Design a protein around this ligand. Structure first.
Ligand SMILES: Nc1ncnc2[nH]cnc12
Ligand SMILES: Nc1ncnc2[nH]cnc12
Lengths: 245, 245
């Protein structure tokens, strides 16, 4: 076998899944890529593109843990993704996050997963883990990108559950129990699936609201702008991942 | 093309996924089949068998909606399942169900899925549905099997969530809100995935407890016996599905 050392500039095996939960979260991705095909599968549409020597598979999952698990599994198992990036919006728990701020997940839990009647901690089931770890290399890359962009990007724990949280008491329980800086409805599900399949993943969220009584209105106001903020950063990540030595 | 009308007795395309959540729920399945191979994939083991002209793929998912979604998707997408049967234990809501009684799902909801801050009903997200319908043909088959066995088998709505419910107030809310006869932690997730992939499915549960303050103890006492009850019925279903004209 002969490899000349430049093959990756022409075509490599890497296939990057880029996912959101809602159409507003991925359309800015599809606008940057511009040209792509689409496949109807698993009740959804999966868009594919040839991008600078790698291939992209892009989709929105629909909301929640089950749909996001299905899309993540589909992108890996059926569309052959080898890395996964998630872009979307989230509710802020930490007071240092405000509308529009980006947060990269260090690790994620499922805040509504509860078999505590058997004395296990919140978020745990046998053979599982309270937290699932996002990929360290991509987190480092995100630091490089943030500086290049001149942007302030926090790193923290994101908690995932199948509820839109619009209630400070719930919000505070989640923050306290898990040390979570932000909450959302897909990240931890996606992480568990990627982890199961040995696929490194990266979860990015732009804050849309503060998970309180005003959460739904803020979410409506800032969905499009926050979604665009996340998506712009994610495309910079893709360009970086294509550039690896 | 020539088909003589008996090919299905020798080898057909049908591949039956048989799934539980826990090892205790599938081991009685693997004992009946006796001989099988195993594949390590998606952080789990998937067992495969050649059974009377069809092939079986069998696995336990681990507990909850994310893991069960991942296993269902894996069985279909990677192992090529074309029908799916789920066997396990559940908590009774209806007072007519007692420990050991079997319940076949007519349809299933996710009782903890909540974006009601946007005025949608409980259990609903856009592009989804409050209930996902189990396969009518298999439900009819289950009636045929129940009579042949001389067994009383109820049909009803099963509600799924990522909580072991050991609390009458929660139990009653779930019963009232969804009209649910029983609750558990995987069925509705599995259904959504099968539905997305156009795979007919069948969910069977044997009651292990009544989802009250005594739920965990009852569950421990009756896990093995209830799991065996479900598994015996499921193998009868398989023999029926192999027998289709
Ligand atoms: N408040 C909230 N709860 C759950 N998911 C969200 N995504 C954005 N805001 C959210
Ligand atoms: N009480 C309960 N809650 C959730 N899942 C169950 N499976 C069996 N019993 C259960």
């Amino acid at each position: 076998g002969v490899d000349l050392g430049t093959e990756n500039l022409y075509f490599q095996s890497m296939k990057i899944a880029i996912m959101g939960a809602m159409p507003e979260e991925i359309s800015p991705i599809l606008e940057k890529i511009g040209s792509y095909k689409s496949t109807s599968y698993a009740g959804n549409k999966y868009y594919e593109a040839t991008y600078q020597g790698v291939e992209l598979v892009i989709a929105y999952s629909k909301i929640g843990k089950v749909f996001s698990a299905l899309s993540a599994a589909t992108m890996i198992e059926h569309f052959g993704a080898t890395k996964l990036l998630f872009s979307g919006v989230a509710g802020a728990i930490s007071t240092n996050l405000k509308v529009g701020d980006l947060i990269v997940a260090t690790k994620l839990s499922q805040h509504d997963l509860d078999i505590t009647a058997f004395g296990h901690p919140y978020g745990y089931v046998p053979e599982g883990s309270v937290f699932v770890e996002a990929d360290k290399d991509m987190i480092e890359l995100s630091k490089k990108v943030a500086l290049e962009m001149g942007k302030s990007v926090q790193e923290g724990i994101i908690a995932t559950g199948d509820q839109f949280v619009a209630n400070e008491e719930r919000k505070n329980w989640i923050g306290t129990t898990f040390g979570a800086d932000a909450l959302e409805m897909e990240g931890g599900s996606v992480g568990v699936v990627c982890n199961a399949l040995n696929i490194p993943f990266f979860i990015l969220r732009s804050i849309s609201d503060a998970a309180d009584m005003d959460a739904s209105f803020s979410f409506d106001e800032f969905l499009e702008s926050s979604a665009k903020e996340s998506a712009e950063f994610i495309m910079k990540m893709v360009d970086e991942l294509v550039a690896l030595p």
